[PDB]
Ligand binder design. Sequence first.
Ligand SMILES: C=C[C@H]1CN(Cc2ccccn2)C(=O)[C@@H]2CCC[C@H]1N2[S@@](=N)(=O)c1cc(Cl)cc(Cl)c1
Length: 128
Amino acid sequence: GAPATVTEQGEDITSKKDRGVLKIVKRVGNGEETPMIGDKVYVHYKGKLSNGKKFDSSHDRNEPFVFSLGKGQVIKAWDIGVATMKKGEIAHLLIKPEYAYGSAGSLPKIPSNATLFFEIELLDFKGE
Ligand SMILES: C=C[C@H]1CN(Cc2ccccn2)C(=O)[C@@H]2CCC[C@H]1N2[S@@](=N)(=O)c1cc(Cl)cc(Cl)c1
């Protein structure tokens, strides 16, 4: 399925080149610009655990998730990954725990040592 495919066929987008965050672009977005640090980013997403469980989805809430890019409001992989996306892009990310919730996990939904899969759509970015 899609998690296996990004694991086996994704590109390493980390600065360290440690394969901690792999990406596939599913739908090419608009032009060349990506958001900058501090921008208000609007995304839709779905997240899955390695046991197959969908653990979260913004689509199911009928509202995007909004955050300020690069300010540590989200897991490291999101700050890294969303920064690579163009407006309108849809991407898959495969994230090792070191770029997510690590050995702690995040109770109740995220186990210890969890590799995470996301599908993310960048709706809009604005501001700083
Ligand atoms: C909807 C909440 C976000 C939670 N966070 C930030 C955060 C804040 C506080 C505690 C744990 N994580 C995050 O960094 C990431 C990425 C942005 C979307 C979503 N998560 S998430 N989908 O991984 C998620 C979803 C859910 Cl239901 C629980 C957790 Cl602990 C994490």
